[PDB]
Ligand binder design. Structure first.
Ligand SMILES: [Zn+2]
Ligand SMILES: [Zn+2]
Ligand SMILES: [Zn+2]
Ligand SMILES: [Zn+2]
Ligand SMILES: [Zn+2]
Ligand SMILES: [Zn+2]
Ligand SMILES: [Zn+2]
Lengths: 444, 446
């Protein structure tokens, strides 16, 4: 536990440490191999997003029982490359960054599972599947979006969701042109044991060529022996997920609804509008499973594999709400991810050979600023758990979308080989850290 | 020891900063043994964004700070202050409340220096190290009366109480002539650190209204209390002792010492409407003005002579000043200036073996690294980095002439004995207790 000791106004009352950490940190360090890996990604969850969400939901002296409970921490760099020059591009897109940790190769903004030469590389999910391990891919967003897709697809443009967009924007990857296919076609080919998220609308599209030509991708999946679940009741009813009966969960047309509702940040919002208190999103049906609910069922099904498993969990709507300059939606998705991190650690502590990693693909726009601030961008005053006002600001874009930032950010880990996230590392080091931990070998 | 990119950042594994497994090396970095010395280096407003922007510019994205990034044990720490009336958190701290938190282990309100929300003074880590017979050093690139060096030697209810003039008016409770301990400078001279180096010479021109050295300038008071006064690099070098008999006071500027790099101020649509900038040495900085590393190196040399040990604090204060000024070049230049000082500290620590070196910031700041094409509402600028690529920096949290601090948790890094105590999530106040325990210091207030 790293919460404040007691009276934050008294000497020592704000301390998060109870004593010396040397002995406990020594015991946290293991050279032994990981049987399983649980990688949790908060999309755009920079140190600012963690602090804003803790300050709001848990109080400044508060503590995330998930996100902040990982003992070994560091900062890692996530710059992408300029496709023409091969030089760094200091602000990565979600796809170039997801490619970096899933393949250990940097790439250009737009690329998914391919380097700057458009050459595809095997992913940590593919290599784990090759070694006989169970594979899980869970996201709160569309399964075709950057984070879940980087594990199962190789396309020259991250916009190549289905056959329609692929033929037009990735002619080289289009199935009817000799290519591996759209992100969804490649996802179905990849055959992860557990795939849960949104992006049901692309499964409505039909294949232009191949073995399941003229049938919807939804129909292709059914014909290929997949289990299709669309709500929390049916997801719960699943008892097995393997290579014979793989599980595909489609819980939204696009992105699954955000858990918290609040207004969008506005120009002088902290001055001109009242302090906001986040409310549960009423449009969200209770039948839509949460990230922790999906994480928990994935963990359950994947741990039946005696050789081990690799699971990736993506709190993708953190980024979406940061883009939308919506502090409530953004904080809500950080809280949603914290619940999933808690499930992962609960499991890891009990199992003993599970490496849990919690990080982000890049930093984002949101900043915590003084309540009195007169900023040129979009702002909002929020009423936190402390009973004090916090002002959040979005001042890096005049367009309707707030943008990613290139700041290095927190990488945290628990379990075997977790020492490899401490100090300064690169997003690509994460790939090799995972590969080594599971004792995987290059395969495609 | 090195965390630069392996080779070809475009090739698989070429961008890796790791050469192998880090478990064994991190096990060896962990020491339960006590620290003979501590070197605390503070980059004022040096959030993770400031570290990245500087590295990207000066060393390349796959680059590495031989100082700042060479500390093996790392974590994130929280630096919120308190609202004086409610005692509730104030999510964005000023420099003085944050400096008070790590130097006393007590949170305080924005304005306070060395005092809690009740205006009650608490002993500082410098005071306790001095009480146990250790040598004490306080080095900064800005005014010695400013937040970071001041939090170690003064207790005032307003950080603006530099000299007797401002104190009588804004801190009547602390004013010497009203029974108080005095202005920041009066308290600094009383604190008698063995080594004090920085700016803020103009306040030493003021005379005391009351006390033992009434009617004499604070500069004359220092001389009368056996201090050594140095004002340039040549004189700093000429110093040989620095103890309680002959303490050293270095005043290298009237106010803040000039920044090392010159670049234009960020402007509205600067990345679009103005050419990419390349930072140039500041022509207003004389070579006679000592650098942070030069001051750090002489302080380490003089304090080392103490057989019982020493406590040294080093403040790269102008990082904040240039972030406030939305000047990417000045800001990056001062992060580079601090990296040189961190290098001196580690060079020393690695050789000595019992020195705990800590590198952190008092709070985060405004600057953000954004896409080159960005159309931002605030102030922006395009910069030509070591990579031969353009980096755009943005300042979008203030319409006023000063960019503001941010409340994001930030990096804390450490090397040496008890360095494990910065790993994971901690509080700025945990740093005080980490340093107290490492040196085996006991609560004392002379
Ligand atoms: Zn992203
Ligand atoms: Zn593949
Ligand atoms: Zn995004
Ligand atoms: Zn500051
Ligand atoms: Zn005192
Ligand atoms: Zn020297
Ligand atoms: Zn400041």
């Amino acid at each position: 536990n790293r919460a404040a000791q007691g009276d934050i106004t008294a000497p020592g009352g704000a301390r998060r440490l109870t004593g010396d950490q040397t002995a406990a940190l020594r015991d946290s360090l293991s050279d032994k191999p990981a049987k399983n890996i649980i990688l949790l990604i908060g999309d755009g969850m920079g140190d600012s997003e963690i602090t804003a969400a803790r300050n709001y939901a848990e109080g400044a002296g508060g503590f995330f029982k998930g996100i902040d409970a990982l003992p070994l921490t560091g900062q890692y760099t996530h710059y992408a490359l300029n496709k023409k020059t091969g030089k760094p591009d200091y602000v990565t897109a979600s796809a170039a960054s997801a490619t970096a940790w899933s393949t250990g190769v940097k790439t250009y903004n737009g690329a998914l599972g391919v380097d700057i030469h458009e050459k595809d590389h095997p992913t940590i999910l593919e290599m784990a599947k090759a070694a006989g391990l169970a594979t899980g891919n869970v996201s709160t967003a569309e399964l075709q979006a950057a984070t879940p897709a980087a594990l199962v697809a190789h396309v020259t443009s991250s916009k190549c969701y289905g056959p329609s967009a692929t033929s037009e924007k990735c002619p080289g990857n289009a199935l009817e042109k000799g290519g591996k296919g759209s992100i969804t076609e490649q996802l179905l080919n990849a055959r992860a044991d557990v795939t849960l998220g949104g992006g049901a609308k692309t499964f409505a599209e039909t294949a232009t060529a191949g073995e399941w030509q003229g049938k919807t991708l939804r129909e292709q999946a059914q014909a290929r022996g997949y289990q299709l679940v669309s709500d929390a009741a049916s997801l719960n009813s699943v008892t097995e997920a393997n290579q014979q009966k793989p599980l595909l969960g489609l819980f939204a047309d696009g992105n699954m609804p955000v858990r918290w509702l609040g207004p969008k940040a506005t120009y002088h919002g902290n001055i001109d509008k009242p302090a906001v208190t986040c409310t549960p999103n009423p449009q969200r049906n209770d039948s839509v499973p949460t990230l922790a609910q999906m994480t928990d069922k994935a963990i359950e099904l994947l741990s039946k594999n005696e050789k081990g498993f690799f699971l990736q969990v993506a709190g993708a709507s953190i980024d979406a709400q940061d883009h939308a300059a919506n502090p409530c939606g953004q904080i809500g998705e950080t809280v949603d991810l914290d619940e999933a991190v808690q499930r992962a650690l609960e499991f890891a502590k009990k199992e003993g050979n599970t490496l849990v990693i919690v990080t982000a693909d890049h930093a984002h726009a949101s900043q915590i600023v003084a309540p009195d601030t007169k900023a040129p961008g979009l702002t909002q005053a929020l009423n936190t758990k402390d009973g004090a006002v916090m002002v959040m600001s979005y001042g890096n874009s005049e367009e309707d979308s707030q943008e990613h930032t290139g700041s290095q950010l927190r990488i945290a880990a628990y379990g075997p080989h977790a020492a490899n996230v401490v100090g300064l590392t690169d997003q690509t080091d994460l790939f090799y850290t995972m590969k080594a931990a599971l004792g995987l070998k290059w395969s495609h």
